[PDB]
Please model this.
Amino acid sequence: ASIAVIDATVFMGMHHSDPEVRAQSLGFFGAFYSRQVMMSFGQIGICDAIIWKKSRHLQDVYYPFMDVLHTDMDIQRQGYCNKVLKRACLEPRLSVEKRLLVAHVVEHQLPFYTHDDSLRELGLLKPFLKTFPASAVFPENLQRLYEQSMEMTIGKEDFQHVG
Amino acid sequence: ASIAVIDATVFMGMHHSDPEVRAQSLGFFGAFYSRQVMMSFGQIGICDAIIWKKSRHLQDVYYPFMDVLHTDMDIQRQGYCNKVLKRACLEPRLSVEKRLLVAHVVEHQLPFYTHDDSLRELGLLKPFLKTFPASAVFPENLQRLYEQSMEMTIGKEDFQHVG
Model:
């Protein structure tokens, strides 16, 4: 009924240079691997936009983990509706993708997980911001794909120079 | 100055079961391989949302072609701006992603390529709808990745059951 909603910061956080952010993202996917998670079309594109700027070798080791994860994990991939679009225009300065993401969380009253500091400071999202779970794991085949994909490193600069 | 804008129908059209649609999409990428093409974050996510619903084997043969194409071809991957968001709310029934796509093409007056029949019939997009080029090719390494990826087949049902 109340599906968890994340953005690119949670997914790409599994490969963040900061080990504390990587621990938080690993704790979320480890606790929601057999649950439901929602991702918008825009957030999915933001992830690939960051990866496709990397070298050929780094993409070849990361993408196997990403594709198998999206396949074996019930990640609901959808788009925003008209009620979210109308709310995103009436709110006052963030990117349109963030305006739609905030409007979607507030409209449908869904739990929201994110590392984006521009969204956590928002008082409107405080009733929906949920703390990341702690460490407590994927199947062995997905574990080997993850550790082989850790050669990819995501930083704060990847989200600043996106778009 | 005037970059070509496409959607998921043009990109995923290269693997469409209809051979006439596949010929049109192959003609576009063949003529724009060394040029500039724009894709929004949403349209990129729509492509992956269609692929991740396929089997593990079909994803493993398609994604090498998609990833190498995005890397070696200057595909501008961005998001919509506030001027596009305000216009998308004032227009009258399409999905929010299509409302933002139509608003972006009309706002910036960019050439638009698409197979979406719900957009081609729009009179507002007629000054910007451009006909697909004819057949006239990728490098050999990308050709082998494409023909190996043709095992993936996209149909009209993939876009109807998306989201």
The interface with chain A takes residues 39-46, 48-49, 52, 56, 59-60, 63, 67-68, 70-71, 75, 77-82, 84-86, 88-89, 95-97, 99-100, 163 of chain B (CB under 8 Å). DSSP finds nine helices and three strands in chain B. The two ends of chain B are 33 Å apart (CA to CA). The beta strands of chain B are 4-5, 37-40, 75-78.
